[PDB]
Amino acid sequence: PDVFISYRRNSGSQLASLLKVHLQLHGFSVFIDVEKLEAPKFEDKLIQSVMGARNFVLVLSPGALDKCMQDHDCKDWVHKEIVTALSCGKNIVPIIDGFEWPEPQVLPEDMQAVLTFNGIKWSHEYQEATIEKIIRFLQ
């Protein structure tokens, strides 16, 4: 698939579903059933999924990176996915949906760089125009 969407399940899942729907309707392939791979049993397949997609779309919902803080051992799935995307030089497209930007130093060093990728602000009022802006950022 062209696109891997990383998000925090308890705050970004509805926007993630909307993105999966509208990106596919616009002809971009997206990893759909990723959550089942976020288990120690399937970790290798999860990493390979991020590595296989050209585009890494990151939903930054409120508090989305909080579980990454002090996650020095990279046990958090979003943390793992971000580190994998950064490591491979993937096209990273953050989608901002209520996120409060933290100081980089509160995040693990291996993912602070994610904060340097220009994001797209989500707007429910102009959902479709926002989808078109996201597509313009995809490679």
DSSP, collapsed to helix, strand or coil, labels residue 1 as: coil
* DSSP state, residue 82: H
Closest CA to 30 of 40, 22, 41: 22
Q: Do residues 76 and 82 make contact, with C-beta atoms less than 8 angstroms apart? A: no
- What is the amino acid identity at position 101? W
Q: Do residues 78 and 67 make contact, with C-beta atoms less than 8 angstroms apart? A: yes
Q: Does 54 belong to an annotated binding site?
A: no
The experimental resolution of this structure, in angstroms, equals: 1.7
Report the alpha-carbon distance of residue 29 to residue 25 in Å, rounded: 9
Closest CA to 68 of 40, 97, 99: 99
Report the alpha-carbon distance of residue 85 to residue 79 in Å, rounded: 10
Q: Does 9 belong to an annotated binding site?
A: yes
Q: What are the catalytic residues?
A: 81
Q: How many domains does the chain fold into?
A: 1
**Which experiment gave this structure?**
X-ray
Q: For residue 6, list its beta bridge partners.
A: 58
Strands 120-121 and 3-6: unpaired
Report the alpha-carbon distance of residue 110 to residue 112 in Å, rounded: 6
The secondary structure of 9-61 as a DSSP string is HHHHHHHHHHHHHHHHHTT--B----GGG-SGGGHHHHHHHHHH-SEEEEEE-
* DSSP state, residue 105: G
Q: Does 8 belong to an annotated binding site?
A: yes
- For 33, the domain range is 1-139
